[PDB]
């Protein structure tokens, strides 16, 4: 019954501690990620506020002139 | 946010400035129009200006009398009226627009300005 | 471009009301409304489709079939006696263009 319990301990401890520190440094790029993309959505929204009032521009443009 | 000049009162015949200094954001992302409300009646579009671009449209009743400018150095957009006749006399409106992306609508308005054309 | 509305509006309080708003082609999202209270400055009420400014109370409608824009108003209160405008852009000229306005009278 026993004899190999004891080897087998160590190796489903070592393992699976490995386990713990991988998880840690995916939590990292997790948040790392959401970072990039919170900076992504605020670059879009200045992006598409900027087109708009560009697309406008030329609409008046064309109205001065035509 | 919107804060316009004082009352006057003008000559007919004369000229007046008005200006419209807006605060809280960035100026260059701003839209603008002057609207004027006649004693009692409605509101009445006379102008848009885009800061950023420096030109402005003008409704057509007002063609070559109104001039509008902004001044991104002292966060101001102006509008001016020439040849005054008792027939401009109203408050003028100092109205931004473009508050978001979708929004074409004159979402900050400034206190008025009442201008008085009288001899 | 021109919009039409009707001069005066009356209303029991409770019930709604409804302000219409008529012109050729009014383009889609350029339609607003405005509310403005005898001696204010406009106040945008409602904006393009159905969008309420942050601030606006929810009883505040915006609505389009043809040729027509309509402000409704559920359960009217007296408070909201006012003068009723809307306005849009000229899809052509880009010029902005108001309606002749709508004095709200609140009956009771």
């Known amino acids: 019954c026993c004899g190999g319990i004891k080897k087998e301990i160590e190796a489903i401890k070592k393992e699976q501690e490995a386990i713990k520190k991988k998880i840690e440094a995916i939590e990292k790029e997790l948040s790392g990620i959401v970072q990039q993309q919170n900076n992504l959505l605020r670059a879009i929204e200045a992006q598409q506020h900027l087109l708009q009032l560009t697309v406008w521009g030329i609409k008046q443009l064309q109205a001065r002139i035509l | 946010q919107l804060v316009q000049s004082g009352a006057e009162v003008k000559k007919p015949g004369s000229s007046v400035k008005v200006s419209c200094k807006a605060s809280?954001?960035?100026?260059?992302?701003?839209?603008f129009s002057w609207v004027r409300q006649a004693p009692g009646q409605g509101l009445e579009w006379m102008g848009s200006?885009?800061?950023?671009?420096?030109?402005?449209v003008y409704a057509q009743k007002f063609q070559g009398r109104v001039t509008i400018t902004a001044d991104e150095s002292t966060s101001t957009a102006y509008m001016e009226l020439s040849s005054l006749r008792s027939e401009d006399t109203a408050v003028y409106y100092c109205?931004?627009?473009?508050?978001?992306?979708?929004?074409?609508?004159?979402?900050?308005w400034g206190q008025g300005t009442l201008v008085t054309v009288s001899s | 471009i021109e919009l039409t509305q009707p001069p005066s509006v009356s209303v029991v309080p409770g019930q709604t009301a409804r302000i219409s708003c008529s012109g050729d082609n009014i383009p889609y999202e350029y339609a607003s409304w405005y509310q403005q209270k005898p001696g204010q400055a406009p106040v945008l009420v409602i904006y393009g489709d159905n969008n309420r400014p942050s601030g606006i109370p929810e009883r505040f409608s915006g609505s389009n079939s043809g040729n027509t824009a309509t402000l409704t108003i559920s359960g009217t209160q007296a408070e909201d006696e006012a003068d009723y405008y809307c306005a849009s852009w000229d899809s052509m000229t880009v010029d902005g263009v108001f309606g002749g306005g709508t004095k709200l009278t609140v009956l009771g």
């Open positions: 809280g954001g960035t100026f260059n992302s701003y839209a």
């Open positions: 109205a931004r627009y473009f508050d978001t992306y979708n929004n074409y609508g004159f979402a900050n």
């Open positions: 200006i885009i800061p950023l671009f420096g030109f402005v």
